[PDB]
């Protein structure tokens with residue numbers, strides 16, 4: 001039987017426009033879909049279906065074969081009650097504590113489970129043609145599709161049967177499903193960990209399922225990117241002014257940060273290049289501040305009922321800083337990504353940050369991206385390798401928010 | 407007596423919860439009733455409509471207007487509000503610059519498109535209408551549609567869709583032939599010798615005829631050039647249909663809008679067309695018949711456009727075995743022009759870009775946006791991005807992108823020395839300037855009165871304060887910086903607590919909507935060295951606390 005699916009009350013299905021595709025990707029999509037149609041996974045639809053979700057073609061990480069990526073962001077928002085509330089997959093706190101976590105793509109599992117007839121219409125998508133020559137080619141899904149958060153929700157019961165022997169024989173390995181992927185964490189030595197991952201691949205294989213980051217993730221390695229303060233044999237007015245500014249903003253996050261003593265040095269209307277010797281009082285104020293910034297922030301906790309936000313700053317020289325929070329200045333996590341153009345590097349950072357978020361909270365953040373919307377939308381697929389897509393919006397923060405995180 | 411297609415029907419629904427229409431029929435004149443009786447009789451013989459009775463409770467009003475020829479008009483407004491949404495037919499229109507040249511091309515327009523496609527049987531009941539009795543005395547004569555009606559919300563989509571399915575087997579049969587579908591027209595191109603092409607057109611017509619779709623025979627088909635959507639399509643070139651720029655001593659807003667529209671349309675193949683000055687005349691409250699005297703600039707721009715247009719220009723068709731090359735030139739304040747060719751200098755098309763993104767900007771940012779606009783347009787028209795030639799040095803672009811806080815990426819491009827070149831007109835120092843005066847600046851505006859003060863104190867003991875009326879906090883912070891710039895020598899350090907002012911100036915603007923920002927830019931260019939730094943307000947920071955007290959007097963606390 002199929003599991004019936006409902007929409008958010010008074011929500012209609014998605015009507016999202018297809019962003020334009022290059023010829024190469026159109027041709028790739030036509031080949032993929034022709035084959036999926038023959039296998040019965042999708043069917044052509046008539047004009048009495050008014051819905052649309054965008055599609056793209058990408059390359060997975062090492063591979064050179066094209067893969068279809070459906071952008072089900074809107075459909076996912078409109079079916080949140082189904083996949084979050086009705087059939088929620090609980091997220092294990094223990095995953096992030098494991099020495100190694102391996103990410104395995106299990107998206108093929110879904111194509112063997114039929115999709116509820118009355119829901120199929122909301123999965124419509126279009127392969128466009130060049131120059132609006134021919135009308136685009138229109139299809140819907142007959143089977144649980146990849147990228148819809150409803151799919152692992154429904155396949156949950158089957159995934160449990162598949163994984164039962166392995167979990168029973170390996171009680172300290174943590175396996176978490178998020179969208180089309182499995183996250184498998186152990187504290188084993190890496191040889192044994194990889195050995196166990198190959199065992200797991202064999203289980204999945206009996207159920208008809210073949211198979212910016214290294215091979216594995218190591219989330220016990222991840223650790224705070226502190227706000228750091230400069231250290232100098234001498235200090236100018238300009239230098240102190242800079243430090244007062246940087247501490248002023250750090251005080252909104254960290255309590256106890258003090259600037260009175262440093263500000264007492266700057267009294268008068270001084271030349272910016274004038275050297276100012278630090279008094280003992282100012283020295284210890286800076287020492288206390290420096291100590292505060294090493295330790296974490298009291299009072300900041302994840303709230304499962306709120307969305308995660310991610311801000312990213314371009315720092316130059318292929319370096320990018322980021323912060324994840326839910327209320328502003330209540331940073332849950334800060335990091336840095338390093339080391340090929342800005343858009344490529346930015347898509348790498350976004351995927352790395354999303355993956356960490358999945359591991360830590362079982363949720364993707366909404367990104368605030370420092371880039372022209374049009375540039376992003378043109379280029380992001382050229383470098384995207386994940387099978388999910390986070391929410392994003394576009395910002396321009398010209399401030400010294402950059403200067404403050406590194 | 408035209409065919410109705412034996413194609414399968416598309417199933418159609420009312421929007422959830424809604425029932426069909428029940429709009430009362432208003433009494434009609436005898437003349438109109440008689441016209442309608444004979445139109446309907448004839449349509450019934452052809453199978454287009456069928457008679458029903460008062461068992462069907464639905465109704466849509468009917469009308470007739472006249473010439474000797476009478477026409478039936480059905481007002482489907484109410485049915486349309488109650489009918490499901492469909493997929494939209496055209497998500498855009500083909501651009502000629504995108505077409506690949508064919509030896510032979512034929513246009514086939516389908517005769518009575520809609521009336522030859524059958525309507526879903528379960529839906530027909532909702533299309534019921536009533537020819538009333540003379541003086542509404544007895545019951546009317548009631549009919550329903552069997553085919554796609556004119557003016558009903560689903561007809562366009564269900565027709566294109568039907569035509570798509572019907573063409574499919576012919577396409578597999580004839581993969582070398584191109585067939586574009588636009589509204590009622592089939593546009594058919596081949597590289598066959600002209601006899602074998604005329605034959606294939608005949609096969610297509612017969613295939614279409616076998617599906618109940620009639621088309622014109624060879625004697626009745628349009629010959630080239632083809633006039634189509636404001637374009638001329640010839641065998642080896644294309645252009646826009648001729649542009650008559652009317653002469654006139656007097657210009658109404660209506661005339662100017664119509665002119666601007668024509669020039670905008672001409673700009674896709676006539677390079678260098680400008681409309682900026684003509685558009686400046688349209689901003690403001692303006693009735694369509696109000697005469698607007700052309701300013702000197704608008705006359706100059708018009709004369710320049712007339713020159714570009716006096717000799718006809720045509721574009722070439724696309725050759726997919728070759729790169730696209732796009733060139734961009736700066737034309738003036740905020741105006742950019744571009745050409746795309748494959749072989750220099752035989753343009754496939756041209757265009758213009760002139761968009762203010764944000765209140766303050768520079769030529770490097772504008773060129774990037776222009777590149778981004780051309781890139782998207784190329785993906786739509788040709789399925790690939792072009793290689794660019796740009797009037798900016800590689801070193802200028804490098805400096806800008808590596809220092810700027812936003813991610814930016816122009817695809818493959820080369821520098822071309824076609825002045826004016828794009829550059830940055832000043833830069834800010836990364837370090838404080840030894841031997842230069844340090845100005846601490848601030849501004850304060852009163853929210854109630856709108857009065858404000860702007861001023862500075864300097865490390866050399868100078869101070870000034872100017873008073874301003876009907877201002878805002880933002881304005882006073884920029885006025886303060888402007889002051890420090892006028893009163894300083896060629897090197898100066900400036901300290902502000904305005905993140906707003908800093909952010910604007912750090913992006914190295916060369917143009918702005920603000921008169922005041924332009925005056926700052928003007929000053930910044932004349933300096934040799936400027937260092938600009940920010941400090942937080944109200945922390946008792948040396949020089950800042952004192953300019954603060956100065957400008958706050960009589961304004962705030």
Ligand SMILES: N#Cc1cc(Cl)cc(Oc2c(Br)ccc(CNC(=O)c3[nH]c(N)nc3Cl)c2F)c1
Nearest residue numbers: 507508509510511593594595632634639640641
């Ligand atoms: N009316 C019309 C019309 C509109 C469009 Cl957008 C296309 C169209 O058909 C064409 C097709 Br199909 C393919 C290429 C071109 C460009 N023109 C030619 O190749 C061409 N060849 C010849 N012998 N005449 C013409 Cl015109 C085509 F023009 C015809």
Ligand SMILES: [Mg+2]
Nearest residue numbers: 848849903943
């Ligand atoms: Mg201030």
Ligand SMILES: [Mg+2]
Nearest residue numbers: 849850879883
């Ligand atoms: Mg102020």
Ligand SMILES: [Mg+2]
Nearest residue numbers: 848903943954
């Ligand atoms: Mg102040």
